[PDB]
Structure 1
Amino acid sequence: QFNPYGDNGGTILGIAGEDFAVLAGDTRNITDYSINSRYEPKVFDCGDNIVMSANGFAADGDALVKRFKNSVKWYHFDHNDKKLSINSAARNIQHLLYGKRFFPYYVHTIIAGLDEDGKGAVYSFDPVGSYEREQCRAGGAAASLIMPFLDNQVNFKNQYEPGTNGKVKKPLKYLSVEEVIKLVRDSFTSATERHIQVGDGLEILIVTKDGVRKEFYELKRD
Structure 2
Amino acid sequence: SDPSSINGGIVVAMTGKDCVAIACDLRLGSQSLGVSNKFEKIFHYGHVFLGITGLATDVTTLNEMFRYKTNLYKLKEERAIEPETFTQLVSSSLYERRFGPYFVGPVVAGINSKSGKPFIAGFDLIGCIDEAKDFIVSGTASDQLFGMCESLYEPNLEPEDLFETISQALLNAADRDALSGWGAVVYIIKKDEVVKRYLKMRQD
TM-score by length of 2: 0.92
In the alignment, what sits opposite 2:38?
Answer: 39
Structure 1 residue 211 displacement after superposition: 3.3
Cα RMSD (Å): 1.7
In the alignment, what sits opposite 1:28?
Answer: 27
- Unaligned ranges ≥5, structure 2: none
Structure 2 distance, partners of 1:123, 1:73, is 21
Q: Which of 89, 114, 117 pairs up with 2:115?
A: 117
Structure 1 distance, partners of 2:146, 2:137, is 5
In the alignment, what sits opposite 1:93?
Answer: 90
Helix, strand or coil at the partner of 1:123: strand
Structure 2 distance, partners of 1:5, 1:120, is 32
In the alignment, what sits opposite 1:149?
Answer: 148
Structure 2 letter corresponding to 1:118:
G
Structure 1 residue 153 displacement after superposition: 2.6
- Unaligned ranges ≥5, structure 1: 156-172
1:218 aligns with 2:203: no
Structure 2 distance, partners of 1:5, 1:182, is 32
In the alignment, what sits opposite 1:163?
Answer: none
In the alignment, what sits opposite 2:17?
Answer: 18
Structure 2 distance, partners of 1:109, 1:217, is 22
Structure 2 letter corresponding to 1:146:
L
Contact 2:3 2:54 in 1 (8 A): no
Structure 1 residue 193 displacement after superposition: 2.5
In the alignment, what sits opposite 2:174?
Answer: 192
Aligned residues: 201
Contact 2:109 2:121 in 1 (8 A): yes
Contact 1:51 1:205 in 2 (8 A): no
Helix, strand or coil at the partner of 2:65: helix
In the alignment, what sits opposite 2:48?
Answer: 50
1:68 aligns with 2:50: no
In the alignment, what sits opposite 1:162?
Answer: none
Contact 1:43 1:51 in 2 (8 A): yes
Structure 2 letter corresponding to 1:72:
T
In the alignment, what sits opposite 1:180?
Answer: 162
Structure 1 residue 4 displacement after superposition: 10
User: Cα–Cα, structure 1 residues 193 and 96, in superposed 2: closer, same or farther, change >3 Å?
Assistant: same
Structure 1 residue 122 displacement after superposition: 0.7
Q: Percent identity?
A: 23
Q: Which of 117, 123, 126 pairs up with 2:124?
A: 126
In the alignment, what sits opposite 1:107?
Answer: 104
TM-score by length of 1: 0.85
Structure 1 residue 117 displacement after superposition: 1.6
Structure 2 letter corresponding to 1:70:
Y
Structure 1 residue 145 displacement after superposition: 0.5
Structure 1 residue 12 displacement after superposition: 0.8
